[PDB]
Amino acid sequence: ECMHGSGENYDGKISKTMSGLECQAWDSQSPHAHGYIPSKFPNKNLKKNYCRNPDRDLRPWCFTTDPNKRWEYCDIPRC
Amino acid sequence: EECMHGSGENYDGKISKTMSGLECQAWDSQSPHAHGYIPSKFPNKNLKKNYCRNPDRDLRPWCFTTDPNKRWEYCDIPRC
Amino acid sequence: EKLTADAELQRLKNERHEEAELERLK
Amino acid sequence: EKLTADAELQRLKNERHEEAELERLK
Numbered sequence: 001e002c003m004h005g006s007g008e009n010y011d012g013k014i015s016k017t018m019s020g021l022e023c024q025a026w027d028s029q030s031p032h033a034h035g036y037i038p039s040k041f042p043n044k045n046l047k048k049n050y051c052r053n054p055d056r057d058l059r060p061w062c063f064t065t066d067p068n069k070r071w072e073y074c075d076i077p078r079c
Numbered sequence: 080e081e082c083m084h085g086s087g088e089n090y091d092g093k094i095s096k097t098m099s100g101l102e103c104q105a106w107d108s109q110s111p112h113a114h115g116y117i118p119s120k121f122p123n124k125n126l127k128k129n130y131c132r133n134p135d136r137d138l139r140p141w142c143f144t145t146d147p148n149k150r151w152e153y154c155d156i157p158r159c
Numbered sequence: 160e161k162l163t164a165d166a167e168l169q170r171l172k173n174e175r176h177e178e179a180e181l182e183r184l185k
Numbered sequence: 186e187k188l189t190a191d192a193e194l195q196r197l198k199n200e201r202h203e204e205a206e207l208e209r210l211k
Contacts, residue, residue: 070204
């Protein structure tokens with residue numbers, strides 16, 4: 001429930017962005033169409049709408065439920 | 080070969096420009112725009128060089144643009 | 160979510176299209 | 186490496202990153 005470096009391993013349950021937006025569940029395309037399908041990267045834990053770092057990005061992220069904000073970085077507690 | 084039958088779904092022509100003149104980025108490039116219409120992913124879609132294609136049921140054939148600010152745009156293919 | 164090529168292109172068209180509406184609208 | 190989960194993971198990322206910079210400069 002806190003992370004390492006980049007969070008390539010975070011499997012925590014935080015589901016909001018650094019600005020408070022509830023994340024969009026990875027297995028939905030609403031409000032945002034995207035290709036981070038879980039069936040596709042099954043080993044990356046694109047579990048519910050939990051923040052995740054599947055792409056060697058700088059820190060966990062997710063897609064926003066706000067239609068105007070495609071995606072944001074999350075704020076995960078560094079351990 | 081060089082005109083449009085319907086919505087361009089079967090168009091294998093050569094035009095490489097958007098309705099407004101911008102030059103198409105090449106399907107095989109990820110520059111200037113990163114994207115996932117990798118030709119090798121959809122070989123049966125004639126995603127060649129940088130020619131306007133309609134590989135996914137859009138209204139008319141389109142393409143990714145070389146202008147940094149316009150990722151993609153509809154092309155203007157003569158209706159046969 | 161389906162994994163066939165027809166599904167992927169549909170998501171892609173949907174994607175190209177959402178960013179386009181954002182833009183246009185600003 | 187074009188057709189590998191990792192190759193794709195990196196494209197999907199560039200694109201997020203590109204889409205967000207553009208929106209910035211709007």
